[PDB]
Symmetry: D2
Subunit: 474 residues, 4 copies
């Protein structure tokens, strides 16, 4: 149980107000943790700023080596990290341990390698008698704001490319889920020079506002809700801060008549509900051609109904709780508002579970229409909707008439159709005949209200550099 | 006398309010032009949105061809274009014809070539049994907002990459300098399909606010002031619009003891006052090493005093007027504030010219200190200040202690020093033993409050695309 | 009608031996052209080496501009180039004019653009206190050897990236087909500085050998047979000359049971027999799944039998003659070899056309086995074989057990299978559900005995550069 | 000492003839090692080729992990590798351990990361209704030939990119210096799947020729002499094998009047004679402007003469022996022909050292002229020549009139000139005011008779891939 902030190479108790941290599987408080005070946010940013003079002139190879050691330390401590995440998030331990930990280590190893591989334009005399070259320099201090659904994983996605690029970082995890960030703080303390990495604790208003609005923070990076994104953008507009934003999605799952229906069902059973659907790429919005609609709904309803909820440290557990009491009510409301339309049918689920801890039933809803709030707004819970469609053109225009733009999939056995739909979809990512898969080499990020900017890949690193032109007269 | 807007392939009169356009050399009204109405702003964006369906799916080759045509049409009308810009802007005719026109033509020809040269990640199996590929797709409707200092040039810088990336465009020129834009509108009418290029006219509040606020606008690109920049980021925050920003600069000209002093004087006499200093890269704030400080002030004062003001259409004319009455007043005020410091000597200039038109005397200001407003804040007039400095480390630190980050130069004969200073400058571009030189291949753009995003280069193209990951299960 | 060599900016008669050039549709001599003498070969190389001192220091902009004006000139002379190519090669006029001319113009336009877009590595301090940058400089004099199948087109493929990169070029066309290249010589005389382009006439032994063996030639680029590839490689090994090689292919066309059979027939009818099959990507070797083999053989033999041979200048003509008397004998003996195998049935064709000029009948052969010479060796004629297969793995292993690696296609409606096979095929190109399509943006070039290096695309330009590291100590 | 071959996952004794390995400090025989037999060569290529089936389809993540593992194993055994290298090559122990070992480990760590960062072209529709993507797939079996100057390091330069690209490898070390190769074999046995790495022992003619001439080998990579290069090119010509060649250089050291003479002296003293000058980037050829010529020659002579020879395992030792008796015989004869020219003065050295072991005296030769053999031919021993020049243009022309193209440097304080001369030099790399410095991210490789292709950097990985165009019809 580690509870202190990391500021300028030191572990320090927050001197701000204490706040409760819950075990969502039971509703019990794990502990109370004191927030960073106004003075602590400011000290953190100042240390980062002072660390940048030397840190921002390091070589790729030195940064690469810091990142590989950070990778090793997380890997050697995988068990402890999974346990804290499962306790804090209610993730089934086996899921946290087997799926997330290996990914988090790999993010770090991949960004170590990428640090050393940055592209440019050929240097030469584009104007007679002058030599031009292009560099990628870092920006300075980055404010990173991580969400509650993948606490350590988001932390890794924000830290790794910022560091790789030669910036100093001030990280605020969600106040719901600080436990693994504060264990990382303890373990990562001496890997980077003092002030290069600072990790704080507390709420958006009390810690987040002073952080993101500091005159020395040159870039804010955020993964959370659109209203938060909107807020950070206006709040930092007076200093034209670089922003980097991932604000959720509402992935259409387009299933045509020639899809392997069993594979769709097997897929959605996992991708609709994994992490209780609190996932920015959740397979939550099915468009199913009218030919296969009834068969899909029946078979999906029956596969979803067998998802096993239980203790997170039980291996048989597939579906854990929601993140907080408030989130549970949020998800519950959305479903009741679906029900209230009169044409949406509950195929299975649609209830909070009995007990303490924040469990909602795995839910499937059918007969959802394009203009329904269930289709158009992100629910972020263990809830999947099904909408009938007639034809390719109509369903592509529906999928793309969305304010979201992060992820999507198409299920069809036809080569031509898969490539047509793929080319047209206005989403950061499109899977063909699967969903959900990410690799550290391939960029994750949105368009429209989903945001802009990439996590993972070389693009991810590029977002934390400024491209510069130096032209030398002969 | 071309006064009509281009909306959906048609030349139409503005149905909003009449406004005056002036000749800055004489102070006379050139004509009055009806602004675009609220309804016309909305029709333009609707046209571009509907045109995007087909235009976003065109090939690189087809967009390139359209862009070569556009280039052609500008070069065929270069003499006319240069005349309109001179009349509206007060630019010397020979300068607008011999410097601006070819560069404009070349911007379009460059971007035609780069539309076909877009980079990606090697397609392949990053996860066993799944082929990943990476795409660069267009955003939709771009709202482009251009300044009054380089009206046709900035229009090109905004039009060329956005079209090359596959977007549709709604362009608003400065209400002060619309004449080349409206001539472009007539000339380029049938080169792109209806709705792909739309050009309007009117002020920021009455036309720019409803344009950048349109729900169908996905990206807003602005060259203009910091205040305008902050306001647009605030205004479009609610829809997380991509923003692309170039908000000016204050280019440090760092001159060491071993510099070629006569080449510095020759350079600054051009690059300080070209365009009356209304240039986002003007050589406007000199740091001069103490060994050469007084000789430089001496020789620069004498060279700046000879700069010739006169009729724009006269080949001997070197310095034209400022853009408007209010911008003359702004510049004048700045100069007076420097005087009132008590420690700043006027070496030459520092008065408004008698006569009609908005002429300001070419001005050198000496004894400017680091913390003076004349050093920290962009004047955007024919005014340069000179500050003495001691040593390399001190001056780099002073130069980098700015809210601006666009352009800069270092003058020194030593290779080591030139590279050391160039590596450390926090500026989008640094020149060595010159200033001011731009080529279509090399990006131009800032950091800090100068903004982010590039114009020109492969990078300025990348800015109008979304990176997409498509992954196909085997 | 044009017969002079281009040497150092002058048009001059060969002083070597006269050689005959035939019209292959009639077997008549078009004219006799004197070869470059050994002195002229030396002289053209020394002119290119002399021109390289300035040409290799030109800006991308200037090279681009040369290339666009060359593109204009070809376009302007489209009709004439098509007639000469049709006369000298037997290509149906409509095809040379409508297919080849527009691609040739486009190649030069594409490379104009790509010349300004060359990639590199971010410049920076990879070693503390040292700034490294990466350049892409030209090699020098490039000897270019073109084949008889696509005379002007291959001339464009060799010239365009070599010039774009800043090399000087000494081109040798096939002695069988020099006519468009000599017209090129006249037309292009003055677009580049003297000696930057040189065009010669003559055979391999008398002209190629002295050219490719010249001490100042730094790179040889050849499209032609494996034996000429082998020979050039030996003959230039003494001076580690850079080689660039496209040596033919034997494209596997893989047809699965779920293919659109009618589309495969339509495709192979054009792509097996376009240019009388004298094409490096011809669809010449079908592997047909057991399920559809017999249907495919029946439908294909019926489609092949309608191919209309006749006067090249007739709009209805689809199949022109072979390139020479010797090539006709070669093709003929290949077909008699299959037949003598005792298990290959002639479905249609399989003879010489009556009359003069070098026409072979459009030919389909069925029952060819994996180890038959008809399957294994390039015939380069209007001849296509068909071989049954059982399963996917078997046939991918068959297709890959070849000495060729240039092009290939897979025909299947199944997305999974399309991507599996495409991933696995050991060929420079793989089309899915089509064949033969090329674009200037995408590379074309082989592996194994097909050679190495690309034509078209940014990669094609890269092949004519040396990457250089300049490291500057602080 | 370890003497066994690594073939297909097993350590086996050579079954060919026994060859002596020498300690070049003393002339003692270290041991005898049996060569691979022709059967063993064949068996190695066959194991690699069978290993490719699965190894060529691994993900970048997997290969990178094998590479990080191998880096870990070399690092963990750093002290032993350096001892073996020292005993084998006469390298001073402190030099091999402090300089060579860290750089070798880093090569592997670098390539591990680069394996996951491969660039491509943007996937999309370059031809309407067709989706194009670009991949980078492995070649299959690579034969790598390592030299005796940096045995382990060159084995890493060849192994790391070939493996990162997805190829299998059969490495032949120099028969002179196999000890670290065969220690690596032992230690690396189980890191890769069976047959993915194979390490043989033996001579160019008995093991080399059958290895590089094998039908399953698709690429040959050689670092060695020009003769050897020319021979590998002719010998593999019949199968058009990809070759990859680093064949030496003669690096010009260009020293202008404004150079820091003391820095030039301190530089060359190290870079002229490190590794007894048996380096392809040796600072061996000085061009010294007439103003500073006599001072440089005096001071250089005095620095060179203090170079301390002595036992390799002694900390004070700076200069070790040459690599063998024959190489010492060669070096001594190159110096004798320089003396017999009648115009070269021996400033210091110019003799074999008394004793056993192959020590030659650190040697400085003055008054050598542009056309002398000592200036035009690589010597590869502790020998440096000095040539007086008059002007910049003359010396750049002198430096570029070489059949070498690997490395070079320029020493001058002037920014203009350093850039002018760097841009013009026809050398794969140019240092400015230093020489010799290599880093993993930056390519090393030549042009002209120094060969082509690159070691280290992303370029060096690209050299072991085939770019492929996959195009899917809609
Ligand atoms: N990755 C995620 O956690 C995502 C969450 N959402 C949605 O957010 C909705 C409602 O609020 P929450 O969900 O609790 O997420 P949120 O946006 O409120 O929280 C994400 C992060 O932003 C921080 N934050 C909030 N205000 C801030 C401020 N003024 N300055 C700086 N940082 C600030 C939070 O403390 C937290 O670390 C939920 O429906 C959830 O689905 C949507 C997309 C992604
Ligand atoms: N190009 C640059 O980087 C420039 C920096 N500046 C600085 O700022 C001053 C510029 O003069 P101004 O005309 O006042 O403003 P502005 O310089 O920012 O004009 C730029 C463009 O933005 C538009 N604009 C203004 N308000 C808008 C709104 N609410 N919504 C949409 N578009 C809007 C204008 O109509 C014009 O087309 C100068 O003193 C100079 O110091 C000025 C001009 C250019
Ligand atoms: N003077 C003569 O009697 C010659 C006879 N041959 C023989 O005749 C046939 C030639 O037919 P193609 O199919 O045109 O050969 P090819 O098909 O590979 O022709 C491709 C191009 O390579 C050129 N080339 C051929 N040998 C060369 C060499 N040694 N050095 C530089 N360039 C060279 C050709 O002139 C042509 O431009 C072959 O069967 C070959 O054995 C080849 C060259 C000369």
């Amino acid at each position: 149980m580690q509870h202190k902030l990391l500021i300028n190479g030191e572990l320090v108790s927050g001197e701000g107000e204490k706040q409760p941290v819950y075990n969502p599987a039971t509703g019990d408080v794990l502990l109370e943790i004191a927030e960073a005070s106004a003075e602590q946010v400011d000290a953190a940013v100042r240390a980062a700023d002072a660390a940048f003079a030397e840190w921002g002139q390091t070589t790729p190879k030195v940064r690469a080596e810091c990142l590989l050691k950070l990778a090793d330390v997380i890997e050697e401590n995988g068990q402890v990290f999974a346990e804290l995440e499962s306790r804090n998030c209610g993730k089934p331990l086996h899921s946290a341990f087997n799926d997330e930990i290996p990914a988090i280590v790999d993010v770090f190893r991949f960004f170590a390698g990428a640090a050393r591989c940055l592209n440019g334009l050929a240097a030469g005399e584009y104007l007679e008698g002058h030599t031009s070259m292009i560099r990628r320099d870092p920006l300075g201090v980055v404010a990173s704001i991580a969400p509650w659904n993948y606490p350590l994983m988001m932390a890794a996605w924000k830290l790794a490319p910022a560091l790789a690029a030669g910036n100093c970082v001030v990280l605020k995890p969600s106040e719901i889920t600080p436990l693994t960030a504060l264990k990382l703080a303890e373990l990562a303390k001496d890997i980077f020079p003092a002030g290069v990495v600072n990790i704080l604790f507390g709420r958006g208003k009390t810690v987040g506002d002073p952080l993101t609005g500091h005159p020395k923070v040159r870039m804010v990076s955020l993964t959370g809700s659109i209203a938060t994104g909107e807020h950070i953008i206006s709040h930092t507009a007076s200093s034209i801060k670089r922003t980097h934003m991932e604000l959720g999605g509402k992935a259409p799952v387009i299933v045509f008549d020639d899809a392997d229906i069993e594979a769709v069902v097997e897929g959605v059973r996992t991708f609709g509900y994994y992490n209780a659907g609190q996932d920015c790429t959740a397979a939550c919005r099915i468009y199913a051609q009218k030919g296969i609609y009834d068969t899909l709904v029946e078979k999906l309803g029956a596969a979803v109904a067998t998802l096993k909820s239980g203790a997170p440290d039980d291996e048989s557990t597939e579906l854990g709780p929601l993140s907080s009491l408030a989130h549970l009510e949020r998800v519950g409301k959305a479903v009741e508002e679906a029900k209230a339309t009169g044409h949406i049918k509950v195929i299975t689920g649609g209830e909070k579970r009995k007990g303490n801890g924040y469990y909602y039933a795995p839910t499937l809803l059918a007969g959802a229409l394009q203009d329904d709030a269930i289709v158009q707004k992100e629910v972020f819970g263990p809830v999947v909707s099904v909408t009938p469609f007639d034809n390719e053109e109509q369903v592509v225009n529906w999928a793309n008439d969305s304010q979201y733009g992060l992820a999507s999939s198409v299920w069809t056995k036809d080569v031509g159709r898969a490539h047509r739909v793929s080319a047209r979809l206005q989403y950061g990512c499109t899977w063909v005949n699967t969903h959900f898969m990410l690799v550290s080499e391939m960029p994750h990020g949105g368009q429209k209200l989903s945001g802009y900017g990439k996590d993972m890949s070389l693009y991810g690193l590029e977002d934390y550099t400024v491209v510069r032109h130096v032209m030398v007269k002969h």
